[PDB]
Design a binder for this molecule. Structure first.
Ligand code: HEM
Ligand code: RET
Length: 441
């Protein structure tokens, strides 16, 4: 959908009306206009179509919500992602990534090729399930009805994402299994909170169940079980398929630039060796961060942000009324030749390696990996570190190349940019099994 919008943005500019019959979208590719919609005048907008897409699974979760219900739930959930909790989650990122490395090691020894997209999906599902509501999917190793239920739901969400866009049964069961499973976790976590002796503060975290579900229950907001299930469900959907795509496209991009891989291997060998990364390593893995930054620029998740005007406004210098469906093309902002040198080149050092990490503010909204304004992603640090940990640990241990005769790598976008047929790679060990673990300082 958004691929033709790139050339149309080159011809017709930062804001234009895509009409298809009697319906139309406003297509925004101007960083100034994006900043006006996302941050300066955000009160004039709702999530619009986005809610119609995600409502069946996310209910009253943060992403599709607006108004006071959004404001109250945002204020309750954001404290759960404090620095100590993010620091603890980094251990989880290292454990789960290590379980993936073990699979790649097994395949490497047998000369087997690996389809990385499906594995990255299993890895990021295993991470998000433990981090949010203390569930161990173990989708890296096994398949369960719970796991199959999640993917059924994700397939339906992708269908609802493509449905309102012009081109030029088992769901209800999967929802019931996920919701009942959440109920059991909520129940189990309630007993644990009733029995503990911990005092609640701004950095509250039970070291045995550091999940977001546990923080919320120990805070005592006392909302409905549906509202809590939907908040957890929303974060489960948000934190999963986004990073799965980020890792997939990162490693694809690494196949296209062997000089970046040498630079990345050099950093990871020197900074972490065989270690599980820690919070202190997140600042030290500069080039790894830039590689993630540049991957999210080349392949944003999602490529498009969705709003609907609920009041009069001026976009660029065109007046609009309420009721306009707006699609901010993050893809166009990220690749705009106006605002990027060699915009199609994979170049992690396009931001100075020792300068500030890029965000929507210092890039003046030409770069929105996590959005902007009041609706900005609350998991931006969570996911930023999750992906740095995965990249570093994988690159330390293996060399990846496009597999011979692998299917082509094409984009199939619903809510995230998936590939058409996977990312088939040959994986080769960089360290020998009989080598003593290398711990650098
Ligand atoms: C690479 C990974 C991720 C990317 C690229 C990403 C991207 C985004 C973006 C662009 C938005 C803004 C959407 C909009 O303005 O309509 C958003 C919102 C949100 N994200 Fe993330 N996300 C990621 C991971 C996560 C994780 C790990 C969590 C865990 C809690 C999470 C939870 C949320 C929530 C709850 C919102 C809604 C916030 C609100 O509306 O107040 N996301 N995400
Ligand atoms: C907001 C949001 C999400 C959903 C995005 C959707 C639903 C995108 C649909 C885009 C379309 C219609 C693209 C057409 O080309 C995620 C990924 C669940 C989590 C992160 C933020």
């Amino acid at each position: 959908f958004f691929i033709p919008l790139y050339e149309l943005f080159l011809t017709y500019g930062g804001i234009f009306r895509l009409t298809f019959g009697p319906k139309s979208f406003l297509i925004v590719s101007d960083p100034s206009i994006a900043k006006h919609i996302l941050k300066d005048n955000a009160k004039a907008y709702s999530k619009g179509i986005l809610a119609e897409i995600l409502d069946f699974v996310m209910g009253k979760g943060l992403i599709p919500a607006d108004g006071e219900i959004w404001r109250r739930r945002r204020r309750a959930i954001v404290p759960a992602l404090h620095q100590k909790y993010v620091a603890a989650m980094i251990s989880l990122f290292g454990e789960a990534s290590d379980r993936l490395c073990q699979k790649l090691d097994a395949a490497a020894l047998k000369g087997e090729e690996v389809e990385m997209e499906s594995l990255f999906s299993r890895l990021t599902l295993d991470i998000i399930g433990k981090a949010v509501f203390n569930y161990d999917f173990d989708s890296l190793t096994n398949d369960t009805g719970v796991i199959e239920a999640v993917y059924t739901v994700l397939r339906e969400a992708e269908d609802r994402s493509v449905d309102p866009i012009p081109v030029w049964r088992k769901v209800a069961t999967s929802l019931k299994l996920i919701n009942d499973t959440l109920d059991d976790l909520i129940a189990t976590c309630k007993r644990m909170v009733e029995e503990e002796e911990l005092q609640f503060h701004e950095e509250y975290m039970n070291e045995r169940d550091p999940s977001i579900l546990h923080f919320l229950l120990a805070s005592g907001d006392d909302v409905s079980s549906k509202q809590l299930r939907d908040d957890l469900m929303t974060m489960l959907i948000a934190g999963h398929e986004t990073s799965a795509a980020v890792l997939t496209w990162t490693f694809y991009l690494l196949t296209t630039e062997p000089s970046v891989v040498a630079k990345l291997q050099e950093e990871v060998d020197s900074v972490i060796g065989d270690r599980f990364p820690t919070i202190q390593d997140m600042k030290k893995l500069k080039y790894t961060t830039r590689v993630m930054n540049e991957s999210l620029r080349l392949y944003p998740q999602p490529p498009v942000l969705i709003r609907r005007s609920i009041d009069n406004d001026i976009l660029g210098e065109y007046p609009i009324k309420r009721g306009e469906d707006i699609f901010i093309s993050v893809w166009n902002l990220h690749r705009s030749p106006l605002h990027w040198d060699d915009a199609e080149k994979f170049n992690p050092e396009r931001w100075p390696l020792d300068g500030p990490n890029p965000n929507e503010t210092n890039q003046n909204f030409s770069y929105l990996p996590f959005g902007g304004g009041p609706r900005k992603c609350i998991g931006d640090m969570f996911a930023s570190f999750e992906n740095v940990v995965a990249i570093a640990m994988l690159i330390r241990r293996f060399n990846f190349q496009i597999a011979p005769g692998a299917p082509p790598v094409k984009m199939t976008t619903g809510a995230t940019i998936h590939t058409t047929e996977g990312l088939k790679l040959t994986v080769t060990k960089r360290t020998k099994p009989l080598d003593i673990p290398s711990v650098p300082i």
